[PDB]
Motif scaffolding. Structure first.
Motif, mmCIF file in Angstrom:
data_model
loop_
_atom_site.group_PDB
_atom_site.id
_atom_site.type_symbol
_atom_site.label_atom_id
_atom_site.label_comp_id
_atom_site.label_asym_id
_atom_site.label_seq_id
_atom_site.Cartn_x
_atom_site.Cartn_y
_atom_site.Cartn_z
ATOM 1 N N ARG A 107 0.866 -1.278 0.078
ATOM 2 C CA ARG A 107 0.062 0.052 0.042
ATOM 3 C C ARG A 107 0.857 1.356 0.043
ATOM 4 O O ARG A 107 0.543 2.134 -0.602
ATOM 5 C CB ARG A 107 -1.038 0.102 1.188
ATOM 6 C CG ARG A 107 -2.009 -1.140 1.180
ATOM 7 C CD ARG A 107 -2.797 -1.123 2.245
ATOM 8 N NE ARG A 107 -3.748 -2.069 2.409
ATOM 9 C CZ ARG A 107 -5.045 -2.330 3.392
ATOM 10 N NH1 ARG A 107 -4.671 -1.605 4.459
ATOM 11 N NH2 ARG A 107 -5.898 -3.326 3.213
ATOM 12 N N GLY A 144 1.050 3.462 -3.446
ATOM 13 C CA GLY A 144 0.749 5.041 -3.311
ATOM 14 C C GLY A 144 1.659 6.142 -3.432
ATOM 15 O O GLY A 144 1.556 6.940 -4.189
ATOM 16 N N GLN A 192 2.513 6.143 -7.326
ATOM 17 C CA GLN A 192 1.251 7.076 -7.777
ATOM 18 C C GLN A 192 1.606 8.778 -7.634
ATOM 19 O O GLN A 192 1.418 9.352 -8.374
ATOM 20 C CB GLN A 192 0.101 6.730 -7.473
ATOM 21 C CG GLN A 192 -0.599 5.309 -7.755
ATOM 22 C CD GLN A 192 -1.866 5.152 -7.351
ATOM 23 O OE1 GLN A 192 -2.261 5.653 -6.378
ATOM 24 N NE2 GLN A 192 -2.430 4.103 -8.178
ATOM 25 N N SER A 193 2.235 8.834 -6.334
ATOM 26 C CA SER A 193 2.625 10.285 -5.835
ATOM 27 C C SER A 193 3.828 10.553 -6.896
ATOM 28 O O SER A 193 4.177 11.860 -7.113
ATOM 29 C CB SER A 193 3.092 10.311 -4.306
ATOM 30 O OG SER A 193 1.687 9.793 -3.708
#
Lengths: 49, 49
Positions: free
Chosen positions: B24, B28, B31-32
């Motif tokens: 996770r 995340g 994507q950031s």
């Protein structure tokens, strides 16, 4: 080693702060009937504050 | 996830259990980071213009 405990909703709590409770006495290894654990065992709590 | 610090995840959950929370954090942050790179390529076209 306590004589008797309280109910599920009456649970007795003893607040002792700081990182470490006690690393000397560990019964977490095959000393009792049933072990269901999450996270780390009391043996690994020595590195966690 | 449970905590943004990876050390809190590695020092708590088991290696099989930690792989759930670590994925996770990685996905995340991928994507950031991908959003950052995508926005920089757009600003790159603006500054080259």
């Amino acid at each position: 080693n306590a004589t008797r405990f309280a109910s599920v909703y009456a649970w007795n709590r003893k607040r002792i702060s700081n990182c470490v409770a006690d690393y000397s006495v560990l019964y977490n290894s095959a000393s009792f009937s049933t072990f269901k654990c999450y996270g780390v065992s009391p043996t690994k709590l020595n590195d966690l504050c | 996830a449970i905590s943004s610090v990876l050390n809190d995840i590695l020092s708590r959950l088991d290696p099989p259990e930690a792989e759930v929370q670590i994925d996770r954090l990685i996905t995340g942050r991928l994507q950031s980071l991908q959003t950052y790179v995508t926005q920089q390529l757009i600003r790159a076209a603006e500054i080259r213009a």
